[PDB]
């Protein structure tokens, strides 16, 4: 059949091809997501779960309130949806809506990082001890890997030395 | 008019996956390796997680369940998907802990990001209502444009000779007509200035004669012209008559979404000793010793230059695990290329001793035993 | 998402007659538990803990420093509701078996009464006072009293965040100061290195929190007032609370082995 | 016998215009402070601390498991009075000389605002937020934001020290501070007035926000001592 056209077909084409080929799905968000995540590349290191629980996650999303929503974490997507809302409902420009929503994203992330530091600090004031921090653990693993490199280097180094005796 | 099934996919979690952004820009003329590639400056793909129960089944909300050999066992479940379904009918994925945990490490240093300063240290926050601004208006004067960080036009000094020619013949050349109109608006306001003033004690902006003559008056003062041309093409100011002009505008946000702390003007109150002077030290590695006219050190996953100062001089195979020294991160910033450059500064002796005490590996306890 | 649930015996609409007015219970549980849960949800909105219960979050999110702030809300919500599930509309008569065992570990019901109450005021800080049932492989079941600072988990699987001693005034230069100091570092060094200071039975059955007492300011600062003049105050709050303890339910959780 | 000091500007009855009501202040200072003093008077009955001031008791009875109750009440009483000693009746303007130094240690006033308020909202356990001035290498006039948890004092002496005057001027790795501005977060000050904060309205957050508009900056500048470029 004639597949669904997700974008206006080229009106200039006189002899169009691939009429029975499904078209690409492009939304207005795609453009915004690309812009934001390019301005915040390290926002991709924040793990994001794409495993739907029941699919009823878009029923409690009201972007008129703010970035924080029920069921979804605070991520770049919330900024884009919030941006799109302001741009459409409040008749804002792409840049204007981008600035407002983006700035709210920062303040929410700042408190999150402040809690971690104040949490561990205050916890020790009353006799609270924790495990190995991620920094220490990371360094330990490098030791085990660096030592393995030393062995390989020593062997190959000796190999070349023995291989150099044959040149003469 | 969208169908109900099509309305659910728009808001689905999978459809939210951001497009693969271009990799960290490097020198256009180098000898990069093809078969083997090392970790990138900043992440390019979205990192994913799952529940402990769904991970034991290989379910990651993807096309198919991933294998359990390399996906289970680790503490932090992180994975990157290059292609949800490749030509081999397999989800081409790879571990995402390289960048996922590096962000957590950097966020454990508790250090904000500040705009670089030319060489009186002034660490100004990046998230401010005066500098961090992208939207603008045409009526805005040139001065405020320096504050901005996201320019639409390219950086001339950075562009290669080939890219420059293409830009001229595909972005600048087909804009003369529009540029002429831009001048008319300026000349129009100029006629209103005198009128408004004299009235205390705008025109239709259609004058094709003054425009041509107006540009002949600016041929002796090229400075004011470029100042005007920069506004019509949104070019980053280059000449001092300044900010991030040495390496150009930052391709990304000055913070690059790695840390959202505004300032570090706090004093971590230690339980026993009390409010400390400086921040807790951090142990770092030694890479590429001096004996290359500089030493590289690995501070929490990132590579930075060694402090301005044994250990750095020569390599020592006897040292097991490599040379590891304690050091305090003073200042962190993002360059134009997107790298996270750290101003690593030598740490103190007491700070290390205090910090090791909690770890339990301090040889001598300052508390109590220390008589002096 | 974690959602607030009703109270034991309709205390939200009526509240305990002689302990806490309905308005006080409203601000203490409905208007506070909701706040904590609202914050907790935002923290675990997209993590493995999105569907885990409070206790599971408490035990799991304990040693890891990076998630310390999540432990507080989760633990606080648990302890808070744990404190309301032991009251009763009318005072209950202490069970015989429980009554006997108490005297064998504390000497008398009043001896323990003044200990928990005394411990509360002694703390001079927000915390929870528990009643823990200790048990070891061969040692008989023995009860004891424990104090937890701010959000502190009495369970043995959350030993990292027990918070049983304020390091501010408990670590000085006096003989006790040095002693407390050594323990403070001994625990930190052991925990960090992964060593175990005190062996615990699998499943965390050595300690079972039976009864609790919320000494936070929000709970009693309204009904009993600041306490100036000794009329009411934090002291009276603890006293009145001792009359509504559902000793019947307390006996059930004790699960004392038949030895009479 | 320490007596209750009167409030700076008759706030006890009049109250702050938009920060706190007389009833709230009554329970926050008039009643609470008296409670601590009454309990403190019964602990120093005819002793060395009989005539000493609140500050002296803190430093003297500093980190002693035997004088715990003394330090607790003493430190709390002092901090409480100190917090109310920096509340102007109306919004006062910030001096130019102080406005300059804030921009050199934090970059902007809003940055300091979020940093101070942020630290309050992000502290689970009741405490105080202190704005102290210090001298650090590279910045003679350095302003820092520090939080004391529960009853902890901000003064340098109030911490453990070594020997060899035997006691050192500062604690291991510590420095000398001068408490300028404070912010009480205990439930007594904000709970009754602004409520629990359910729903993200009122609560502890709104309390800190309204506290930023009634700071007697004139007095803040006085205790800052911006003239003394070298403090020892």
UniProtKB/Swiss-Prot annotation, chain A:
Main localization category: mitochondrion
Record-level Gene Ontology MF annotations = structural constituent of ribosome
Q: Does the keyword Ribonucleoprotein apply?
A: yes
Q: Which keywords does UniProt give here?
A: Mitochondrion, Ribonucleoprotein, Ribosomal protein
Instruction: Give the gene name.
Output: rsm25
Superkingdom, natural source:
Eukaryota
Query: What cellular component terms from Gene Ontology apply here?
Result: mitochondrial small ribosomal subunit
The UniProt subunit note reads as follows: Component of the mitochondrial small ribosomal subunit (mt-SSU). Mature N.crassa 74S mitochondrial ribosomes consist of a small (37S) and a large (54S) subunit. The 37S small subunit contains a 16S ribosomal RNA (16S mt-rRNA) and 32 different proteins. The 54S large subunit contains a 23S rRNA (23S mt-rRNA) and 42 different proteins.
The family annotation for this protein states: Belongs to the mitochondrion-specific ribosomal protein mS23 family.
Organism for this UniProt entry: Neurospora crassa (strain ATCC 24698 / 74-OR23-1A / CBS 708.71 / DSM 1257 / FGSC 987)
The answer on whether this UniProt entry bears the keyword Zinc reads: no
The molecule here is called Small ribosomal subunit protein mS23
Which residues of the whole protein are included?
52 to 219 of 240
Task performed by this protein: Component of the mitochondrial ribosome (mitoribosome), a dedicated translation machinery responsible for the synthesis of mitochondrial genome-encoded proteins, including at least some of the essential transmembrane subunits of the mitochondrial respiratory chain. The mitoribosomes are attached to the mitochondrial inner membrane and translation products are cotranslationally integrated into the membrane.
Compartments in which it is found: Mitochondrion
From Swiss-Prot, chain B:
Q: Where in the cell is it found?
A: Mitochondrion
Q: Name one GO cellular component term.
A: mitochondrial small ribosomal subunit
Q: Which GO terms describe its molecular function?
A: structural constituent of ribosome
Taxonomic superkingdom: Eukaryota
Cited InterPro entries: Rbsml_bS1m-like
Q: Where is the signal peptide?
A: none
Q: Name one Pfam family in it.
A: Mit_ribos_Mrp51
Role noted for this protein = Component of the mitochondrial ribosome (mitoribosome), a dedicated translation machinery responsible for the synthesis of mitochondrial genome-encoded proteins, including at least some of the essential transmembrane subunits of the mitochondrial respiratory chain. The mitoribosomes are attached to the mitochondrial inner membrane and translation products are cotranslationally integrated into the membrane.
Family assignment from sequence similarity: Belongs to the bacterial ribosomal protein bS1 family.
Q: How does this polypeptide assemble, per the annotation?
A: Component of the mitochondrial small ribosomal subunit (mt-SSU). Mature N.crassa 74S mitochondrial ribosomes consist of a small (37S) and a large (54S) subunit. The 37S small subunit contains a 16S ribosomal RNA (16S mt-rRNA) and 32 different proteins. The 54S large subunit contains a 23S rRNA (23S mt-rRNA) and 42 different proteins.
What is the official name of this protein in its record? Small ribosomal subunit protein bS1m
Organism of origin is Neurospora crassa (strain ATCC 24698 / 74-OR23-1A / CBS 708.71 / DSM 1257 / FGSC 987)
Swiss-Prot record, chain C:
Determine if Mitochondrion is one of this entry's keywords: yes
Provide the Gene Ontology terms for cellular component.
cytoplasm; mitochondrion
Domain of life (superkingdom): Eukaryota
- Keyword Mitochondrion listed? The answer is yes
Give UniProt keywords alphabetically: Mitochondrion
Where in or outside the cell it occurs: the entry states: Mitochondrion
GO MF annotation list: metal ion binding; superoxide dismutase activity
Query: How does the annotation summarize its subunit structure?
Result: Component of the mitochondrial small ribosomal subunit (mt-SSU). Mature N.crassa 74S mitochondrial ribosomes consist of a small (37S) and a large (54S) subunit. The 37S small subunit contains a 16S ribosomal RNA (16S mt-rRNA) and 32 different proteins. The 54S large subunit contains a 23S rRNA (23S mt-rRNA) and 42 different proteins. mS42 forms a homodimer, in contrast to the mS42-mS43 heterodimer in yeast, building a large protuberance adjacent to the mRNA channel exit in the mt-SSU body.
Similarity comment: Belongs to the mitochondrion-specific ribosomal protein mS42 family.
Q: What does this protein do?
A: Component of the mitochondrial ribosome (mitoribosome), a dedicated translation machinery responsible for the synthesis of mitochondrial genome-encoded proteins, including at least some of the essential transmembrane subunits of the mitochondrial respiratory chain. The mitoribosomes are attached to the mitochondrial inner membrane and translation products are cotranslationally integrated into the membrane.
Output this protein's name: Small ribosomal subunit protein mS42
> Which residues of the intact protein are shown?
43 to 302 of 310
Curated annotation (Swiss-Prot), chain D:
Q: Kindly list the places in or outside the cell where this protein is found, as annotated in its UniProt entry.
A: Mitochondrion
Query: Which GO cellular component terms are attached?
Result: cytoplasm; mitochondrion
Alphabetically, the GO molecular function entries are: metal ion binding; superoxide dismutase activity
Please classify the protein's predominant subcellular localization into one broad category. mitochondrion
- Give the residues annotated as coiled coil: none
Keyword Mitochondrion in record: yes
- Keyword terms: Mitochondrion
Provide the assembly information: Component of the mitochondrial small ribosomal subunit (mt-SSU). Mature N.crassa 74S mitochondrial ribosomes consist of a small (37S) and a large (54S) subunit. The 37S small subunit contains a 16S ribosomal RNA (16S mt-rRNA) and 32 different proteins. The 54S large subunit contains a 23S rRNA (23S mt-rRNA) and 42 different proteins. mS42 forms a homodimer, in contrast to the mS42-mS43 heterodimer in yeast, building a large protuberance adjacent to the mRNA channel exit in the mt-SSU body.
Tell me the protein family, please.
Belongs to the mitochondrion-specific ribosomal protein mS42 family.
**Protein name, as recorded:** Small ribosomal subunit protein mS42
Natural source organism: Neurospora crassa (strain ATCC 24698 / 74-OR23-1A / CBS 708.71 / DSM 1257 / FGSC 987)
